[PDB]
Each structure stands twice: as structure tokens, then as C-alpha cells.
Amino acid sequence: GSAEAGITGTWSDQLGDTFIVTAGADGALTGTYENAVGNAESRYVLTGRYDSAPATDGSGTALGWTVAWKNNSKNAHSATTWSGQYVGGADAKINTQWLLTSGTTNANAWKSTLVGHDTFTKVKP
Amino acid sequence: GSAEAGITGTWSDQLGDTFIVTAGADGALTGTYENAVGNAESRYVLTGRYDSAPATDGSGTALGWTVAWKNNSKNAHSATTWSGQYVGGADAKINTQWLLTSGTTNANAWKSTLVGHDTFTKVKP
Amino acid sequence: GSAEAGITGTWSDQLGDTFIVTAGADGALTGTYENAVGNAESRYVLTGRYDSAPATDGSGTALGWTVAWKNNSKNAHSATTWSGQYVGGADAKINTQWLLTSGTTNANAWKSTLVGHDTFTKVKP
Amino acid sequence: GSAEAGITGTWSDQLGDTFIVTAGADGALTGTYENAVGNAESRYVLTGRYDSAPATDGSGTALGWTVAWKNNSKNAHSATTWSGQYVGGADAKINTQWLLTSGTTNANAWKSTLVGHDTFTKVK
Numbered sequence: 001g002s003a004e005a006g007i008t009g010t011w012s013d014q015l016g017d018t019f020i021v022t023a024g025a026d027g028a029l030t031g032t033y034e035n036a037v038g039n040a041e042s043r044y045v046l047t048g049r050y051d052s053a054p055a056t057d058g059s060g061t062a063l064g065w066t067v068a069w070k071n072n073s074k075n076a077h078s079a080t081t082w083s084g085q086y087v088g089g090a091d092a093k094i095n096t097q098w099l100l101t102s103g104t105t106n107a108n109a110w111k112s113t114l115v116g117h118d119t120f121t122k123v124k125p
Numbered sequence: 126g127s128a129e130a131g132i133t134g135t136w137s138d139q140l141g142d143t144f145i146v147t148a149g150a151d152g153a154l155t156g157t158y159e160n161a162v163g164n165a166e167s168r169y170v171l172t173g174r175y176d177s178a179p180a181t182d183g184s185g186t187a188l189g190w191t192v193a194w195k196n197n198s199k200n201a202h203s204a205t206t207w208s209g210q211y212v213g214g215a216d217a218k219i220n221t222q223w224l225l226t227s228g229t230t231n232a233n234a235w236k237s238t239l240v241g242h243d244t245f246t247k248v249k250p
Numbered sequence: 251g252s253a254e255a256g257i258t259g260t261w262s263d264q265l266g267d268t269f270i271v272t273a274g275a276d277g278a279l280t281g282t283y284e285n286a287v288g289n290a291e292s293r294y295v296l297t298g299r300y301d302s303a304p305a306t307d308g309s310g311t312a313l314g315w316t317v318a319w320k321n322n323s324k325n326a327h328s329a330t331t332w333s334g335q336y337v338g339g340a341d342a343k344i345n346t347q348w349l350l351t352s353g354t355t356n357a358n359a360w361k362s363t364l365v366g367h368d369t370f371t372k373v374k375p
Numbered sequence: 376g377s378a379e380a381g382i383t384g385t386w387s388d389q390l391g392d393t394f395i396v397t398a399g400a401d402g403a404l405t406g407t408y409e410n411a412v413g414n415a416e417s418r419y420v421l422t423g424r425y426d427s428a429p430a431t432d433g434s435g436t437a438l439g440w441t442v443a444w445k446n447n448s449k450n451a452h453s454a455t456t457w458s459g460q461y462v463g464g465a466d467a468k469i470n471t472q473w474l475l476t477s478g479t480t481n482a483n484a485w486k487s488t489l490v491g492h493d494t495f496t497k498v499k
């Protein structure tokens with residue numbers, strides 16, 4: 001599975017953080033976001049989806065995933081979703097834009113959502 | 126399961142589409158996005174995450190999910206991620222912003238990502 | 251001008267705030283963003299552009315503007331841009347999405363930008 | 376000076392396009408958005424604002440501007456806004472995110488707006 005094998009592996013973003021992802025044969029993404037070094041308390045579950053039969057015209061493979069920022073010892077009461085595309089080749093990349101929503105009271109809702117972007121480079125199979 | 130029972134159920138967005146979601150005990154979100162009526166060809170898998178121990182200060186519960194727009198008969202080579210928060214009460218709602226990325230060649234990548242927002246209203250447990 | 255006269259006026263957003271705008275014959279937007287009552291210390295300059303010959307097929311009129319949050323007495327070291335479209339009719343609207351960027355250090359650039367949305371309703375011309 | 380002097384000039388983005396901007400002493404931004412070479416049919420007016428007394432603690436200078444995609448010969452019935460911040464130094468940058476809304480009917484309004492990002496490098 002071409003998109004499946006291309007997406008699956010370890011990726012690192014522009015901030016230095018690490019994302020380990022497994023693309024399944026049914027379109028599922030599962031893995032873990034790790035901070036810049038890899039210690040337990042800095043790791044969070046990610047789950048998402050990808051187009052498991054992408055176009056064959058040179059376009060990338062659409063995908064997205066979510067991290068809720070709660071693990072077994074921390075909770076930032078917030079969730080980030082990355083939306084983007086895997087672009088293959090010797091120099092494969094996942095180009096994303098992201099939305100980070102914090103839980104807020106309705107009065108503070110206007111400032112609940114950060115937006116950003118990140119490019120991931122593959123580090124390992 | 127306060128946030129668990131609040132989120133789980135059937136929801137309707139402002140466009141009229143339906144979102145059936147199950148929030149699990151471990152923070153997973155799993156479900157199906159459908160058009161207005163529920164016809165098989167119009168249904169897509171959704172997977173995401175939410176804060177399963179949210180704050181108790183009146184803030185909403187952060188969450189996110191992804192739909193890759195491929196099912197058993199259609200494929201739009203794109204994925205949308207909703208990022209937002211569930212706000213409880215009798216008038217319960219999920220307020221989100223979303224990112225829809227289409228797979229594209231690198232020359233078209235500047236127009237790969239739509240942004241929007243949607244409020245979901247609960248219609249059934 | 252139809253879009254010129256439609257956009258020109260006083261508008262109020264979903265948060266209660268006030269947007270006073272003049273749409274010029276050449277596509278310029280100029281005005282002031284204030285609070286619910288127009289307290290002088292709460293007034294900021296806005297500048298923007300609009301499509302001064304928009305479609306007449308029922309589409310709205312594209313437009314955008316910027317407020318830098320600095321005035322005679324306050325400076326939040328930030329700027330919001332709104333992007334959207336004017337839709338005429340008896341109860342006219344401007345539907346927008348907005349980006350708010352704060353000056354940050356490189357290390358905090360990742361959280362420099364909030365995203366949201368607002369619908370403005372016309373109150374006076 | 377100083378965010379004034381840093382911002383003012385010619386910038387080029389990641390796609391190769393050009394923006395010429397003047398930052399005014401009152402917080403105004405004015406200029407033109409063009410293509411790679413400055414073909415007249417490809418020029419559009421931009422207007423915006425910036426923080427004209429930014430922090431000095433190393434933070435960038437917040438700014439934003441709009442281009443409506445209509446000039447003397449073309450109209451794409453759309454407008455982009457960039458929101459970002461100017462960071463000085465020898466290799467000066469403006470890091471932005473942007474929103475491009477097209478005029479739509481209400482039925483197409485859900486797909487009216489593209490989002491993206493761009494880093495501008497000063498060229499002149």
C-alpha cells in the first residue's frame with residue numbers, strides 16, 4: 001500500500017517535535033505525538049484519517065489527525081487538529097495547517113482557537 | 126461519563142448534515158458523517174479525540190475529529206478536520222472551526238485548504 | 251454604487267462590538283472599530299479593500315480589512331484582519347473569518363495567531 | 376525608523392510573488408501586490424495597518440493588509456487578508472497567515488474561503 005507505507009513512520013515538525021504514525025489499510029491513522037526528546041509525560045495519543053486510495057496524478061494524499069492534550073499525567077484542556085497532505089518522493093513531507101482549540105467559557109470563546117502550520121519531514125520508516 | 130455522555134449522540138450542523146458520534150472512556154471519538162437523509166453513498170467515517178476529564182470551571186470540553194472524504198463508492202481526495210469544544214446545558218452545542226485540505230500538486234498547494242466554521246446542535250442521544 | 255452604499259454604515263458583530271465603515275468608489279474601506287457604546291479609548295483605525303464591481307448573480311461582495319490594536323492610549327501589540335463577504339437584502343450581513351496575530355518572540359511564534367469568525371449586522375448607514 | 380524603516384520596501388514570498396509596501400508613521404500600510412517581474416496587468420492595491428510602537432523585547436511587529444483581486448483589467452471577485460508579524464535582523468522576514476474569501480451564493484458560502492501561510496523575504 002503506497003500511501004500507507006509512505007505515511008507510516010516517524011516524522012519531525014519544524015518546532016522539533018516528533019510524531020509517530022501508523023496508516024492502516026482501512027484509512028485509519030493512529031500514533032503518538034512526542035515532545036522534542038521522547039519522555040513518557042510528554043507523549044499524547046493521535047488519531048485521524050487519510051485518503052487510502054489517493055489520486056495518481058502527482059497530487060498529494062489528503063489526511064488529518066487530532067491530538068487531545070490530555071495523557072496519564074497532564075491535561076491542557078485543549079485539542080489540536082492537523083489538516084494537510086502527504087507528498088511522497090525521496091524528500092517526502094506532510095504539509096499541514098492546524099487548529100488548536102482550548103476549552104473556554106462562552107465569554108472567552110473568541111480567543112479559544114489558535115491557527116498555525118507545520119511541515120513534517122520523515123525521520124525513520 | 127459527563128463529557129462522554131454529553132458528546133455521544135446525533136448532531137446537526139448549520140448546513141443540515143448529520144454527525145453521529147461516540148465518545149469513549151479513553152478519549153476516542155468514532156462515528157459517521159452523513160448528508161441530510163442518511164443514504165449509504167453519502168456516509169463517511171470519522172475519527173478523533175476529546176478531553177475526557179475536562180475543566181469544571183464552566184469552560185467547554187475540547188475535541189477534534191477528521192473525516193477523509195472517501196468511502197466505499199466515492200472519493201473526493203480530501204479530508205476535513207473539525208477543531209472545537211462541546212458546551213453542555215439544555216441548549217448543548219459543539220462549536221467548531223474546520224480545515225478542509227484537498228490533495229494537490231505543489232503548484233496548486235496554495236489553494237489546497239478551505240477554512241470554515243460550524244455549530245452543531247444535538248438532535249438525539 | 252450598490253456594494254458601495256450597502257457596505258457603508260455602522261455594523262455590529264456577534265460579540266456586541268461596533269464597526270463603522272466607509273466604502274469608497276475606488277475599492278477602499280476606511281473606518282473605525284469601537285466597543286458597544288463607542289467609548290473613545292476603545293476606538294481603533296481600520297483600513298481595507300473591497301470588490302467594487304462584484305457579480306450580480308446573487309454572489310456576495312468580497313472584502314477584507316485590518317485593525318492594528320494600537321490607538322492614542324492603548325497598545326495590545328497585535329492586529330486582526332477580517333476576510334469575508336457582504337451579502338445585501340433588507341437585513342444585510344458581512345460574513346467573516348478573522349486572524350489575530352500578536353507580536354511574539356520566535357520561540358512563541360507558534361502561538362502568535364488566533365482564528366475565528368464573525369457575522370456583522372447593519373445597524374445604521 | 377524603525378518598524379517603519381524595517382517594513383517599508385520590496386518583499387518577495389514563497390511562491391515568487393512581489394509585494395511593495397510603505398509603512399507610514401501613523402501605523403498605515405500602503406502598496407501594491409505584483410507577480411515575479413512586475414507585469415502591469417498583475418498589480419493590485421494593498422492597504423493595511425501595523426503596530427507603530429512595537430515591543431522592544433525581541434518580539435515581532437504585528438501587522439495585516441488586504442488586497443482585493445480587482446484592478447484596471449481583471450476581477451477575480453475575491454479578497455485576501457494577510458495577518459502576521461515583521462521580524463527584523465539582516466535577513467528580514469514577515470511571517471503571515473492568510474485568508475482568501477471569494478464572493479459566493481449562500482449555498483456555496485461554505486467553500487468561500489481558502490487559508491494559507493507565507494513568509495516574505497525583503498529584496499530591496
Ligand SMILES: N=C1N[C@H]2[C@H](CS[C@H]2CCCCC(=O)NCCCCCC(=O)O)N1
Nearest residue numbers: 013015017069076078080098102111360361
Ligand atoms: N509541535 C507543535 N506544537 C504546537 C503546534 C500545534 S500543537 C501545539 C502544542 C500544543 C500543546 C498543548 C497546549 O499548550 N494547549 C494549551 C494552549 C493554549 C494557549 C493559550 C492561548 O494563547 O490561547 N505544533
Ligand SMILES: N=C1N[C@H]2[C@H](CS[C@H]2CCCCC(=O)NCCCCCC(=O)O)N1
Nearest residue numbers: 138140142194201203205223225227485486
Ligand atoms: N457539513 C459540512 N460540509 C462542508 C463543511 C466542512 S466539510 C464540507 C463537505 C466536504 C465534502 C468533500 C468535498 O467536497 N471535498 C472537496 C472540496 C474541494 C472543493 C474545491 C473548490 O471548489 O474549491 N461542513
Ligand SMILES: N=C1N[C@H]2[C@H](CS[C@H]2CCCCC(=O)NCCCCCC(=O)O)N1
Nearest residue numbers: 110111263265267319326328330348350352
Ligand atoms: N470583536 C472582536 N473582538 C475579538 C474578535 C477578533 S478581534 C478580537 C479583539 C482583539 C482585541 C486586541 C487583543 O486583545 N489583542 C491580543 C489578544 C491576544 C490573546 C492571547 C491568547 O490568549 O492567545 N472580534
Ligand SMILES: N=C1N[C@H]2[C@H](CS[C@H]2CCCCC(=O)NCCCCCC(=O)O)N1
Nearest residue numbers: 235236388390392444451453455473475477
Ligand atoms: N502569492 C499568493 N498567491 C495566493 C496566496 C494568497 S493570495 C493567492 C492569490 C490569489 C489571486 C486571486 C484569486 O485567484 N482569487 C480567486 C481564488 C479562486 C480559488 C477557487 C479554486 O480554484 O479552488 N499568496
